Design a protein around this ligand. Structure first.
Ligand code: NA
Ligand code: NA
Lengths: 254, 255
DNA sequence: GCTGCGCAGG
DNA sequence: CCCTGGCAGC
């Protein structure tokens, strides 16, 4: 019976100033995966690097204040890999792959593609690189949990405004069609195992008070290889948890 | 009678959002000099590039959002130089030397030297290059007006806290001594021609609401060469004018 | 629009 | 600068 929370935090210091540690202590997950920490361990106060009861692992971007992932874990993994083995995907603080023996845990910050054609191309080629890696590990016989900010709403049910956003990154046909492809490779959007309601989102704009209106997008996911789905009991969204433009999401297994 | 205003604005777009053009048109100086505009002119609203009754000149830094000087003048100058002919000093949007025939106007944004040892070195060497340039012009017969953010308080009277800043850039012995040196070469701090009082500042920290308590430094100056000092009728601080960490300073000359 | 963080201001 | 005026997020 494990608890895992994934949160795209948008600044680990910012959330800290907002009461991250209290929230984390109230929630007591077995593993806490974070994305977009925008920080390297050296910029973090000692009480954030070292949380009583947890080993911490930070994978910052080469670029200061940019991107970065983190994992807190009551039980250390056996190993921790920080790349797909492709330099351009591996230096942006996007990838954590932790071996917990009963599964591999992918903690991924997938690229925003709305900036340019350059980055949308990078996002998609990142997607490609990820799929190879996850398939290679699954095909070798590992059960895999993937969580993080995928930066793509899968279906029209997954965002408040499906029609106006058909030409926007976050809901382009190429991106949606990569998630179809991913799922069709034997993986399961664990949230939609339990909940097929619309209005269920994980990200909202800061502008136009988008969160209060609930005009949002489901961008953050927990996926599992399908052979492992029986072991998942709960996959939910912690939508009342504030402090970032994303809310956290939760998974419970075995 | 000409009125020149000098203002280190810390963002021209920002001071624009706070009423700059209305203030500008009320003050109506013959020349307005601005430093630290933090803008290339392409980035500026149109009403900042085209001000009725003024030629405008923009000398941006290579670095985006950084430094930069501007000048608005009712009567255009015959030429405008944008450097001393030393490339590391000339790319940072710091220098405008405008030939107004009756005088040269130096609109200079002098470097902040408190970040690093490297930047303090740059500041003092920028000071050396400046003095050499103004001296050459002065020696050749030109009358010179120099306005801008010198980033140094000259004497104890030039800041609220002389004693605690004895070791801080803004008030280092090296920096104060350069101003001493500059003055010794034939140049006059014009505000001190008319006002010997303390508590006269042009810059204050945003932190601790220091402007509301007048806990400030006089970083912004109008200088002239000795030979031109009798032409200056007014040198004052526009300390009520809000919008930046600096306030504007003014000069009146009679030609 | 809005935000977090970088750099820089002095 | 505890305060303020590019890049990126989506
Ligand atoms: Na900002
Ligand atoms: Na800032």
């Amino acid at each position: 019976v494990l608890k895992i929370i994934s949160w795209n935090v948008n600044g680990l210091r910012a959330v800290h100033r907002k009461g991250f540690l209290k929230w984390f202590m109230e929630e007591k997950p077995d593993i806490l995966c974070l994305q977009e920490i925008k920080a390297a361990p050296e910029q973090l106060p000692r009480k954030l690097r070292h949380v009583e009861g947890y080993r911490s692992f930070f994978t910052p971007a080469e670029r200061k204040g940019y991107s970065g992932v983190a994992m807190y874990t009551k039980v250390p993994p056996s190993s921790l890999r920080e790349g797909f083995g492709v330099e351009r995907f591996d230096t942006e603080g996007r990838i954590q792959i932790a071996d917990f023996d009963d599964f591999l845990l992918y903690n991924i910050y997938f690229p925003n593609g709305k900036m340019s054609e350059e980055r949308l191309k990078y996002k998609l080629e990142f997607y490609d690189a990820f799929l190879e890696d996850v398939n290679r590990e699954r095909d070798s016989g590992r059960n895999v949990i993937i969580c993080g900010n995928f930066n793509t709403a899968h279906r029209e049910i997954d965002l408040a405004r499906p029609k106006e956003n058909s030409n926007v990154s976050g809901f382009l046909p190429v991106e949606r069609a990569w998630i179809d492809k991913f799922i069709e490779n034997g993986y399961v959007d664990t949230f939609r195992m339990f909940n097929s309601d619309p209005g269920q989102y994980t990200w909202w704009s800061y502008r136009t008070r988008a969160r209060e209106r609930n005009v949002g997008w489901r961008l953050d996911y927990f996926f599992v290889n399908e052979e492992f789905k029986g072991k998942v009991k709960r996959s939910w969204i912690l939508s009342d948890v504030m402090g970032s433009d994303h809310c956290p999401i939760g998974l419970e297994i075995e």
